[PDB]
Design a protein around this nucleic acid. Structure first.
Lengths: 204, 187
DNA sequence: CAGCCCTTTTATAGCC
DNA sequence: GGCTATAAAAGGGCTG
């Protein structure tokens, strides 16, 4: 139940490219959710997934729920559920997850340059600093900002391309994008380049 | 209002009361289905007749054991009232209806602080009591120490306070959390 | 074979 | 609309 569980954990880890750190910590979490358990009828590889979720985040490098699931089988639901159960059980919690948390990865899979990453990362922080996107999920804001940034450079990517990697839906990205667009000027880096200028950015 | 009891100056408006009552008589759902008409019985999904009545707009789940559950009422007394009307229906159908054991099980209520809230500051400050994952649900699920009621703070100021068996626990929760909400008001 | 799930209500709200 | 989330009862169902 435990050893074979770790058999799968490693498989999970590998598929999404996790190095020793979180991959080990997830076993340490999982071994505890057996001692200090109370995770009763929960899938052993659900307790696992959630662990390799609370792990990435405790390492300072989190991935979305959709990211873990796409290497799991146990629904986003269960990993969301056992995740909550696990934090309570073990009397531990995490750090919130922010705009500039997925910017590195999202941008790498999107194949954009350090230029675009940095600006998306500065836009998203000011979007929040300027409270332009009230109750939006940080993933959404980020995917939105990544669309402003990239669309204002050469290397552009579409909402279907960004949404696809960010794990969100064009509709949603459009929602935040359109919320921050009206402040586009105040959002970019300053020394930002511009294959296409703000007065030209898609209004959406 | 009553600043002695609701110092916040806001009184949570009750939104849904769930009560249970035991009719004593063993019911024939098969029967009850055929004539009730305001009912709805489907052995397929749920093993209980699901009957509803206009005024007070409630819904009842009736089992072949006498045990009924009333939900939807916007007030205990009303939950109680409707619960009687159900029994009197079952009664008027040919059953030994008895209003034994009636009890209020959960009071759901809502509220509006009238100001937006910096959830993250609250999720961070009341770590022990708060769960705020924008990824799983757009609300901050707070779990109050005493009373044992769950609130669900949002960014707009609308609150939702569940788990109460006594409307006053509901009040004790909000007044408890109000000065936390006020502290984390959005600048 | 303790443990969750189904079903019904209600406020609330972002994402699909 | 739907999903997700919270509490609560009822009795059967599916189960790790």
């Amino acid at each position: 139940a435990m050893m074979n569980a770790f058999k799968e954990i490693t498989t999970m880890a590998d598929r999404i490219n996790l190095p020793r750190n979180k991959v080990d910590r997830t076993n340490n979490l999982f071994r505890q959710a057996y001692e200090q358990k109370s995770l009763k009828g929960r899938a052993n590889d659900a307790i696992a997934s959630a662990c390799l979720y609370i792990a990435c985040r405790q390492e300072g490098v989190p991935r979305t729920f959709k990211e873990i699931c796409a290497v799991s089988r146990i629904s986003k639901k269960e990993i969301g559920r056992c995740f909550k159960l696990i934090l309570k059980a073990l009397e531990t919690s995490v750090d919130l997850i922010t705009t500039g948390d997925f910017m590195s990865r999202f941008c790498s899979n999107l194949c954009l340059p350090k230029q675009v990453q940095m600006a998306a990362t500065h836009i998203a922080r000011k979007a929040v600093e300027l409270d332009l996107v009230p109750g939006r999920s940080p993933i959404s804001v980020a995917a939105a900002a990544i669309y402003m940034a990239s669309q204002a450079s050469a290397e552009k990517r579409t909402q279907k391309e960004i949404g696809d990697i960010a794990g969100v839906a064009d509709v949603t990205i459009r929602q935040s994008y359109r919320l921050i667009y009206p402040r586009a000027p105040d959002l970019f880096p300053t020394d930002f380049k511009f294959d296409t200028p703000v007065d030209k950015l898609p209004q959406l | 209002v009553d600043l002695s009891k609701h110092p916040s100056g806001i009184v949570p408006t009750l939104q849904n009361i769930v009560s249970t009552v035991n009719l004593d008589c063993k019911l024939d759902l098969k029967a009850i289905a055929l004539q009730a008409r305001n009912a709805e019985y489907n052995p397929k999904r749920f093993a209980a007749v699901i009957m509803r009545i206009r005024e007070p707009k409630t819904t009842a789940l009736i089992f072949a054991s006498g045990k009924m559950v009333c939900t939807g009422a916007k007030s205990e007394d009303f939950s109680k009232m409707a619960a009687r009307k159900y029994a009197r229906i079952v009664q008027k159908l040919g059953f030994p209806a008895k209003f034994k054991d009636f009890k209020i099980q959960n009071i759901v209520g809502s509220c509006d602080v009238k100001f937006p809230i910096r959830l993250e500051g609250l999720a961070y400050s009341h770590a022990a009591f708060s769960s705020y994952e924008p990824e799983l649900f757009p609300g901050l699920i707070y779990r109050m120490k005493v009373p044992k009621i769950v609130l669900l703070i949002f960014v707009s100021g609308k609150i939702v306070i569940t788990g109460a068996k006594m409307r006053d626990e509901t009040y004790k929760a909000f007044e408890n959390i109000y000065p936390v909400l006020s502290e984390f008001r959005k600048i």
